[PDB]
Design a protein around this nucleic acid. Sequence first.
RNA 1: UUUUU
RNA 2: UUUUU
RNA 3: UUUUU
RNA 4: UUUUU
RNA 5: UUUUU
Lengths: 186, 76, 186, 186
Amino acid sequence: HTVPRIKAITSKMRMPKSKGATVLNLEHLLEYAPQQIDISNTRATQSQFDTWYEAVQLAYDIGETEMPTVMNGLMVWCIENGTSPNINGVWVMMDGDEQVEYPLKPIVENAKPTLRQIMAHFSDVAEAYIEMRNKKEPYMPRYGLVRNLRDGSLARYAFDFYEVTSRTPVRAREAHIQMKAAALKS
Amino acid sequence: QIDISNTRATQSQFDTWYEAVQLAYDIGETEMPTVMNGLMVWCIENGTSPNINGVWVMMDGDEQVEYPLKPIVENA
Amino acid sequence: HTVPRIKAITSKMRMPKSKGATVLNLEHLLEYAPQQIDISNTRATQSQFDTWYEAVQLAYDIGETEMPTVMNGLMVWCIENGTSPNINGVWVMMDGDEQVEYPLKPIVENAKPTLRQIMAHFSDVAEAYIEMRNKKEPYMPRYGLVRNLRDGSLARYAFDFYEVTSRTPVRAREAHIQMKAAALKS
Amino acid sequence: HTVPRIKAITSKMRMPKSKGATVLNLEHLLEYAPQQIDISNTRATQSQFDTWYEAVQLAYDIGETEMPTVMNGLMVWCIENGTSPNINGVWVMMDGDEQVEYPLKPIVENAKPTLRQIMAHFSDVAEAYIEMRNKKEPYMPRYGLVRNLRDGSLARYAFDFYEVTSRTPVRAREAHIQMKAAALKS
RNA sequence: UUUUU
RNA sequence: UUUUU
RNA sequence: UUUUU
RNA sequence: UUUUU
RNA sequence: UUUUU
């Protein structure tokens, strides 16, 4: 009489078995819903990110409360300039009309496995920041200018450490693939 | 078709790998299937090349737990 | 009833967190609006520029009031001739119909990290100066002639130390990319 | 139900055993976290450093309070000039515009196993000092000039007694390897 | 910049 | 990033 | 995976 | 078959 | 390890 429903994982499906015992736990698998970025190797683990954050905070001898401002400045600077392992010298923050420099050693030396993977944690906020800045003036990150990005509307994706995810425009995905290929090309 | 395909590890090889990875983690019979769920999802996201090294990640809710990748690749 | 607005940075966005504490300061990030050229590594820092300016002023034994004229002349000379680290000898100013030479050592030796990055601070004024000079006669900087720039309308961008920014024509950006590639090519 | 964690040192690992008894103490090994430079033979032991410091202080008949200034001067002088066992004569400090010389015998004779290994204790402070000096003028240590170091940004690593550690740039590591090979080459 | 006989 | 004289 | 300054 | 991180 | 003045 009633219309019969179907289970997400069908009852009769070939399953990995060891010693004639199912190797997976379906009860947990159905409820296991980890975000794509939390189980990606292209992004530094939470432990690695915490280690790097603590190391950089200790290197600058900066307190807990002041560190987030430094992190805002570092994210913006990385948005402008690449996050390669080779960057050296000092990165710059603007305290209004005054320029303050911080050493880049602590950031690159403690960033494991890479500074790009560490900054991947800031990818969404970098997107939002570029969106905000573009709402008030033409703000193409310098990485996009180096790559000769002509779209202009792709500025929000045109930084070195952008983490490509499932919920990104296909246009943005293709643009970033092309940009990475061009940058890696000698 | 999949039980007589060389593109798929034999049942004996799969059992050997499963036992080796279970022994490497010092994990019991009951807890291993959860680790296998996490490993399958991680492999779904990231490739299954012989070169993958470091740690693969499971999510115990909002907490990230890492397991060494050596036992998985060396015994496979 | 009323149409509901949306925040620039959405409330529910993945954020970098260390020890279950947000790593960024949104209050400051929203108000953090640093110019693109003030946080660019392709441009010498303000401290480095001040150090170079002071060093060059002291080398010439020139006063505070007379230095800006020397800087005008140096900017024009760099517009004509490249800003490579190799330039040696004397650069030239015109005191009317009289030619006065200044040693190039102090300019190149004190210019850190590079003379190009130091002259990047003069990029906008160089643009304006080339515009002005072109309004009265054909004035293509010698760097554009060496690069065989045929457009003519791109003269305003055809100098060695032009700082490419977000608000530059796409035509100018492509032209300068091609010119830099040609110059670096052996 | 819960996701099972793993121990840093797995329970079932082959261990060195003598007479069927584990030779290592895991409890202490897990907590044993000695800095890399504190267990390196390329650096004089703390006892050797104390012996050398006491010997040099006694040779100069200088008090406890005045010795650190002499040590600052000696570190800077060693930064400029090499720390070979052959250096003889007097090393120089600047008391403003006045030059004061100290005999080099006490420093080299009491420095065991080598003066380079003794000065390795000053490596980090030498790095910082070169960084500071470079922030105000081009300051390449004379050892870098003798080695013909062209990078300029590597000045902070371009002294004889630099102690290569895990947290040093790969660029700096390669540069110092090349510099040491060139210096040792006849 | 030099290197155009 | 540098390498455009 | 890394390699995008 | 392997080689897809 | 030493050998870098």
